[PDB]
From Swiss-Prot, chains A, C:
<feature type="binding site" description="axial binding residue">
    <location>
        <position position="40"/>
    </location>
    <ligand>
        <name>heme 1</name>
    </ligand>
</feature>
<feature type="binding site" description="covalent">
    <location>
        <position position="65"/>
    </location>
    <ligand>
        <name>heme 3</name>
    </ligand>
</feature>
<feature type="binding site" description="covalent">
    <location>
        <position position="10"/>
    </location>
    <ligand>
        <name>heme 1</name>
    </ligand>
</feature>
<feature type="binding site">
    <location>
        <position position="299"/>
    </location>
    <ligand>
        <name>Ca(2+)</name>
    </ligand>
</feature>
<feature type="binding site">
    <location>
        <position position="298"/>
    </location>
    <ligand>
        <name>Ca(2+)</name>
    </ligand>
</feature>
<dbReference type="GO" id="GO:0042279">
    <property type="term" value="F:nitrite reductase (cytochrome, ammonia-forming) activity"/>
</dbReference>
<feature type="binding site" description="axial binding residue">
    <location>
        <position position="26"/>
    </location>
    <ligand>
        <name>heme 3</name>
    </ligand>
</feature>
<feature type="binding site" description="covalent">
    <location>
        <position position="226"/>
    </location>
    <ligand>
        <name>heme 4</name>
    </ligand>
</feature>
<dbReference type="InterPro" id="IPR003321">
    <property type="entry name" value="Cyt_c552"/>
</dbReference>
<feature type="binding site" description="covalent">
    <location>
        <position position="183"/>
    </location>
    <ligand>
        <name>heme 6</name>
    </ligand>
</feature>
<keyword id="KW-0479">Metal-binding</keyword>
<feature type="binding site" description="axial binding residue">
    <location>
        <position position="379"/>
    </location>
    <ligand>
        <name>heme 8</name>
    </ligand>
</feature>
<feature type="binding site" description="axial binding residue">
    <location>
        <position position="411"/>
    </location>
    <ligand>
        <name>heme 7</name>
    </ligand>
</feature>
<feature type="binding site" description="axial binding residue">
    <location>
        <position position="35"/>
    </location>
    <ligand>
        <name>heme 2</name>
    </ligand>
</feature>
<keyword id="KW-0106">Calcium</keyword>
<feature type="cross-link" description="3'-(S-cysteinyl)-tyrosine (Tyr-Cys)">
    <location>
        <begin position="299"/>
        <end position="301"/>
    </location>
</feature>
<feature type="binding site" description="covalent">
    <location>
        <position position="292"/>
    </location>
    <ligand>
        <name>heme 5</name>
    </ligand>
</feature>
């Protein structure tokens, strides 16, 4: 059984923790629930750690007193189809392979599934580690609780004796790097300096061997990613988000200074050897928009190239860990600002961006966001009980599974079927425009080889490449973004029409140039 | 927000609690979750209580860290038909009135329903308090969470100015007495001497005015009836059961000495 | 009412039947249930048949005493969508037309449906008989019992006065030949010599007019295909299977000699005029793996061409009735061994194989097969009754319809939804790789015309054609195979990655050669 330690001993050296812990809703929660610090207390000085205390980062450290939230979190939504490739006619991006040719996502890009699996899915996807990591057997794919207990309880490593990224299966890639892990786990929260910069006190950084780092990580979406363990107050821990909101002064709601001030973030820094080491962002309110924006954003978490001169931008560069914190119509400016692109298209030769799940930046400015609605209202609603203590569901999933608690709790004028119908109207319309956008992108792409064989000039091809950047951006945002337009229907529509317009312009340019060579 | 107290100071006087608390699965649970002892600590000696500390007996004291058990407990099983008289042809004892004639159960004896309602149901049944206590309105019969929060949040007393047992409705009885309450609540666990014997330190006993006692009681089936709050270990608190098992030497399984 | 005949009279001449019948579980079943032999007994000699006895091959001959098995067999699974073309974006092979161009399956290839319909579906499919045979009207498509009673009770023939294969509808083919029928019916079991070789006593053979043969056939999947009618013991009757297992000595489990010996096959031959005529394969155990492998295998049942010199291989050749009895990674060797390919691709000119439903050869080596699981455990499970005599369900269908009897009977650790989720993980992953494999095959195929117009050398085109064979094989196995990887997930994955690798190699080769002509 646990035996409490004297927190006053700790508070002598840990004044920020004292301030947070004594004032918040965990003032009665003893340190032993999460730290084994006996040898540390015997050996530390005011400025030197001595022996490192052991800190629990498993989610069961919180389940101890918060079983309802834990159990809701670890539920597996079996209706969220697993390992479902997006580059298929029945999924989100039927022409993805042609359009993304040159990028690692061509090797595999599945739809998301339940949060329990985030770390294991990151480890096993064909694009990440060359097939090095696999489930121990095909039964383990169902085991959400097991994945939560730890990735290495359900996975195997093809070669524990080597730590290099390489291909073990032929049609895999090795895109994973240390920055990725920040959106899969925070088991490394005490071992990673802010932004992944090099730091004497950091075991891991942007430039680490990712296979070695992987082996040290266990748990998905730790509870403390949104809740400070010392104050129990709302927070974020993700460096890239704090960097956008606070360091760059963009605010929590970059389009609304008033809401940014009311629902702000305060950066708190922790030191090692009296040098800044790590940071968190305490929130003014329990604002799920900002909590979920730790991960559900467009980002760089990867090497790339400069738009200006094509030079390589490696993991050592700060730009390899970057939150753009820009809506679709501000993204090109944001990427030009940091002088960055992701890949060159394998057929067209265009420098292109790679977009990922920009839910937060899409939600901005929507009617829902402007009315003060937040992600949790639809995806983590309060549970309605005839008799009981209310709590917040932590099963982050589609509102279709809890329409009474989600949509219908605000939209009294609708039946469930009516609300579903409104969702589907938007998704169906948006998906139609995604498909048309892909049709036109593909038409343009297929003209590049014809133009090259016809002897069309490099000047014309470069004009078309510039159009490809925009055609790509204004399409891929929406295959990347998970709501199929629901989060911001008007923006999806305007963007996708812009994509089609750009592709059409490029098609006309290339066809005319080919015709003139003939011729 | 709760602020923890120095448990080690309490332990300088409370040695049994120290032994229980420090060894069990509540060793990290601070006393402030259940006791407001500020004035007590300022005034007590090992031999004199001084100011009485306030002890929480509401089930929400435990729901704080054990929501799953609390929420399962307070669920109302709507299929457990409520206020269903047993002395009817379609229930358990069709000829009960003839057979029980002379006993107060002839006035009303319903089937049991969900535990959330035990104390309110005891208070309002026609055989118990002469009809003195009633739900505030007929809607409140559904409110299990409300009953758990406290009986007096959902009930009324026909005459707060008197404390005698009497009939307010013609076909009622006044069978309730203080002993009954021991199977409805343990809100009185610090105010009732073992067995309900007279005791200088007991506010309530077998001979108390049951209407006055009733008014001091709120919560059904307190969580600590089965779980010691200090050790978190399994227990009973009911005097009559301890008396049978231990005092009278009958054992927990009278027909199996080994068990 | 039936009147029994004196079996001892028959046993005087039929000593193999005596031996089988007197010892097995049909020792009390009189010959009159299946044979009208009165005139035969009056006219036969020890070595000459005399008048031919009439043998019942309708399934109702067995339903008489085995109603439960009959009724389960004839059930129509309405959820098995009928006449559903595979070459569509929502089915198994979205790019099948491009990839299979040159082959008769381009005319129509639907998903399988319930067994009751196998013979009628063979007769009416657009690729088989030029549209000659059709349902009497569109209502008859529902009539499983009717199809079982006989094909010609529910079908019409456009021209009873001619027996040639020809097109009656414009977009049909005439691919059917006598070998096909062996996997649709065994009504011809006494009229077809082993392998379909020419034989004095055979009415039908590989070289027969298929339209004439068709008209003589009635019943699907006769009960006696798996159960000897004389001993009631387990067997196979399909010549090609016996040829692989016994004649070629490959065994019932070619990858496991021990299991092959324990679960073997004994070839029993019947003569006409004291010349070998037909054969059956008695099984040591009631092994559904081998029973179902009568049909759910990759085979030749068709003319083709030699790999060595391109010469025609006609129906007269033994190779026109052949079970390869090889896994996907052994198939190229098996086809080279018999010097055979199916068609030349209409665009690339590559000699290609045509694969069909290799379920048996895929299942080998899977975790399930290695643990002693067999087809019936998932597709013909025992029926669970609260009170009753257990029998084996003969409704061969997806285990999704009987998860308690199938998966969950072995996998106690799972709920139904969890087991379904495990299936879907595999199928979704496998289907994604099928789609990607098709993407790369199509990319390669489309380069052939460009390369030809560019003047790329025949040597380079032939190199690419050799790659096409492999790219094709390692893809088409999995669109042909019905489990979408579930039967052997690891093999599907390795094969499909090999397909993509081969196509990519060919794309690079062709693009480089085109570029060099330009450059
Ligand atoms: C002064 C003598 C200290 C005592 C008393 C305690 N800690 Fe400590 N700790 C101390 C230092 C100088 C550091 C390094 C960081 C810094 O503030 O300079 C630490 C670090 C920790 C950590 C972080 C460990 C990691 O992996 O990075 C933890 C979790 C921690 N300390 C906990 C802790 C506890 C629970 C204590 C009371 C039981 C405690 N510390 C006492 C210095 C001192
Ligand atoms: C029992 C010993 C606890 C452990 C272990 C954890 N928490 Fe806790 N938490 C506990 C209490 C008694 C309370 C106060 C309840 C109240 O409503 O007063 C809390 C509260 C929280 C909250 C709510 C915070 C708020 O400001 O409203 C959160 C978000 C929370 N706790 C989270 C949390 C996490 C993430 C834990 C693991 C790191 C964790 N708690 C452990 C008791 C206990
Ligand atoms: C936070 C800014 C992220 C970073 C950094 C990385 N990922 Fe991610 N990932 C993130 C979210 C919010 C989601 C769910 C929404 C979605 O669109 O999928 C994902 C999902 C994945 C998955 C599962 C789906 C799939 O693509 O197959 C995988 C396998 C995955 N992510 C891998 C991955 C890799 C290799 C990364 C570094 C190169 C990486 N992620 C970074 C959020 C974030
Ligand atoms: C961000 C993605 C979250 C993670 C990770 C966890 N929780 Fe959470 N929690 C989150 C939100 C948006 C809310 C509601 C805030 C509001 O005021 O509306 C909560 C709330 C809680 C609480 C408070 C009680 C309740 O409302 O249920 C607790 C005790 C809590 N969360 C616990 C908890 C645990 C144990 C987690 C890991 C299993 C966990 N949270 C993760 C957002 C996020
Ligand atoms: C000695 C100086 C004491 C200290 C320090 C604390 N308590 Fe105490 N307590 C003391 C006495 C002499 C008594 C009377 C009963 C007895 O054992 O003789 C008490 C009583 C209590 C009670 C029971 C109150 C009731 O309703 O009957 C409680 C719940 C209690 N004490 C709690 C408590 C706490 C939590 C303390 C530390 C904060 C504490 N006591 C200190 C003597 C002394
Ligand atoms: C949070 C501050 C708590 C309060 C308030 C209560 N309990 Fe508790 N309890 C808490 C913890 C951290 C644990 C240990 C969990 C573990 O498995 O290690 C417990 C445990 C219990 C148990 C199980 C005990 C055992 O098996 O020995 C019980 C029965 C229990 N708790 C009951 C309980 C009651 C009835 C409470 C109100 C009087 C109560 N707990 C409050 C944390 C917290
Ligand atoms: C524990 C030994 C008990 C004592 C003392 C009293 N009651 Fe009780 N009561 C007890 C149980 C276990 C049950 C549920 C099972 C059942 O058979 O009903 C009850 C139920 C009631 C009810 C509800 C059902 C009904 O009879 O209408 C009422 C109204 C009730 N009890 C009243 C009551 C009175 C007035 C008591 C003292 C005279 C009394 N109970 C004592 C357990 C125990
Ligand atoms: C609106 C036209 C009503 C309809 C239809 C139903 N009820 Fe009603 N009820 C209504 C009002 C305005 C009130 C008074 C509310 C208050 O607190 O002032 C009620 C009251 C009841 C009660 C309590 C009766 C009592 O205490 O004497 C009950 C048990 C009740 N209502 C139940 C109920 C049922 C089950 C209904 C459908 C059969 C129903 N009501 C319809 C208004 C309206
Ligand atoms: C010897 C005089 C025979 C008697 C008595 C019976 N049969 Fe016969 N049968 C005989 C011969 C020589 C042959 C040809 C094959 C051979 O073994 O040489 C047959 C053939 C049959 C067949 C096959 C018919 C077909 O279509 O190929 C059957 C089904 C058959 N015989 C059945 C049968 C029965 C049921 C008899 C007793 C009533 C019986 N035969 C007697 C020779 C002789
Ligand atoms: C009644 C006159 C029968 C006819 C017609 C058919 N079968 Fe039969 N069968 C019958 C009996 C009395 C038995 C024995 C039952 C037992 O369990 O002892 C059987 C058995 C079978 C078996 C089981 C064989 C085994 O070795 O376990 C099978 C597979 C079987 N029968 C199949 C079968 C077929 C395919 C029939 C039509 C050709 C057929 N039977 C007819 C009785 C009768
Ligand atoms: C056994 C080795 C077979 C031979 C010889 C032929 N077919 Fe077949 N066929 C077989 C199976 C096991 C299945 C079901 C599984 C599947 O993948 O479909 C089928 C199915 C058909 C169908 C229905 C589905 C479709 O393709 O439309 C038809 C129309 C069909 N088969 C026709 C057919 C023809 C024309 C054949 C000779 C050229 C032929 N089959 C041979 C097994 C076997
Ligand atoms: C009565 C007003 C009808 C309604 C309503 C439906 N059907 Fe019908 N159908 C009707 C007749 C008189 C016939 C001809 C029957 C005959 O054998 O002479 C039919 C035929 C069909 C067919 C066959 C079509 C063909 O072969 O070309 C089909 C497939 C059919 N009917 C299906 C069907 C469906 C599914 C209906 C609801 C959508 C339906 N029919 C309605 C009369 C009537
Ligand atoms: C191969 C594709 C089969 C065909 C055709 C038929 N049956 Fe079958 N049968 C098959 C299997 C795999 C089994 C189970 C074997 C085992 O021991 O596990 C059976 C079993 C029977 C039995 C035995 C009793 C029982 O288990 O149900 C009987 C009587 C039987 N089969 C009858 C039967 C009939 C009447 C058929 C045509 C409708 C038929 N079988 C076809 C495999 C195959
Ligand atoms: C008993 C006759 C089985 C039936 C019916 C099903 N499965 Fe099975 N399965 C069985 C065994 C003995 C094993 C190996 C267990 C071990 O850990 O040694 C399995 C394995 C699987 C697997 C893992 C496959 C792999 O890793 O390659 C899966 C995904 C699986 N089983 C699923 C499954 C499904 C969904 C079933 C119904 C369609 C099913 N099994 C039936 C035994 C038996
Ligand atoms: O209190 S923290 O800064 O060590
Ligand atoms: O790869 S992750 O960003 O979706
Ligand atoms: O007995 S059989 O060989 O005619
Ligand atoms: O054509 S049959 O083999 O599927
Ligand atoms: Ca999903
Ligand atoms: Ca990006
Ligand atoms: Ca009841
Ligand atoms: Ca089917
Ligand atoms: Ca073939
Ligand atoms: Na979904
Ligand atoms: Na609002
Ligand atoms: Na094209
Ligand atoms: Na009941
Ligand atoms: Na199907
Ligand atoms: Na086994």
């Amino acid at each position: 059984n646990l035996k409490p330690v004297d927190a006053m001993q700790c508070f002598d050296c840990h004044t920020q923790i004292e301030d947070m812990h004594t004032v918040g809703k965990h003032a009665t929660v003893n340190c032993v629930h999460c730290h084994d610090a006996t040898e540390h207390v015997e050996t530390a000085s005011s400025r030197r750690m001595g022996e490192r205390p052991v800190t629990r980062m498993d989610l069961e450290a919180c389940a101890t007193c918060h079983t309802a939230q834990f159990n809701s979190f670890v539920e597996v939504r079996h209706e969220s189809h697993p390992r479902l490739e997006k580059a298929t006619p029945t999924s989100r991006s039927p022409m993805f392979d042609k359009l993304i040719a040159g990028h690692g996502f061509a090797f595999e890009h599945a739809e998301p599934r339940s949060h329990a699996f985030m770390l294991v899915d990151h480890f096993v996807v064909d694009r990440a580690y060359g097939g090095r990591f696999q489930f121990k057997n095909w039964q383990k794919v169902t085991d959400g609780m097991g994945a939560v207990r730890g990735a290495w309880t359900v996975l195997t490593d093809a070669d524990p004796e080597s730590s290099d990224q390489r291909r073990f299966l032929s049609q895999t890639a090795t895109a994973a790097n240390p920055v990725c892990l920040n959106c899969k786990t925070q088991d490394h929260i005490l071992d990673w300096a802010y932004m992944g910069d090099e730091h004497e006190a950091a075991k891991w950084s942007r430039t680490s061997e990712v296979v070695e780092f992987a082996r040290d990580l266990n748990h998905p979406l730790n509870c403390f990613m949104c809740h400070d363990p010392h104050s129990a107050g709302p927070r974020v821990v993700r460096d890239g988000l704090i960097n956008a909101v606070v360091d760059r002064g963009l605010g929590t709601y970059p389009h609304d200074p008033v809401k940014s001030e009311q629902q702000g973030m305060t950066k708190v820094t922790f030191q090692r050897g009296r040098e800044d080491f790590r940071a968190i962002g305490l929130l003014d309110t329990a604002d799920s928009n900002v909590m979920c924006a730790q991960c559900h954003v467009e980002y760089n978490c990867n090497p790339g190239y400069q738009l200006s001169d094509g030079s390589r931008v490696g993991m050592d560069d700060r730009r390899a860990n970057h939150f753009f914190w820009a809506n679709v119509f501000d993204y090109k400016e944001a990427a030009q600002e940091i002088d960055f692109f992701d890949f060159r298209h394998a057929t067209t030769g265009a420098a292109l961006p790679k977009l990922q799940h920009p839910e937060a930046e899409t939600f901005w400015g929507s009617v829902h966001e402007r009315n003060g609605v937040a992600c949790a209202d639809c995806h983590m609603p309060k549970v309605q009980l005839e008799n009981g203590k209310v709590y917040t569901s932590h099963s982050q999933r589609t509102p279709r599974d809890m329409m009474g608690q989600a949509c219908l709790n605000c939209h009294a004028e609708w039946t469930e079927d009516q609300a579903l119908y409104a969702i589907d109207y938007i998704k169906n319309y948006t998906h139609g425009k995604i498909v048309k956008s892909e049709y036109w992108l593909a038409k343009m792409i297929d003209l590049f080889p014809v133009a090259k064989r016809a002897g069309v000039s490099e000047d014309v091809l470069n004009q078309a490449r510039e159009l490809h950047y925009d055609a790509h951006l204004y399409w891929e945002w929406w295959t990347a973004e998970n709501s199929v337009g629901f989060h911001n229907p008007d923006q999806a529509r305007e963007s996708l029409m812009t994509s089609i317009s750009k592709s059409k312009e490029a098609v006309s340019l290339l066809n005319d140039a080919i015709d003139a060579q003939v011729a």
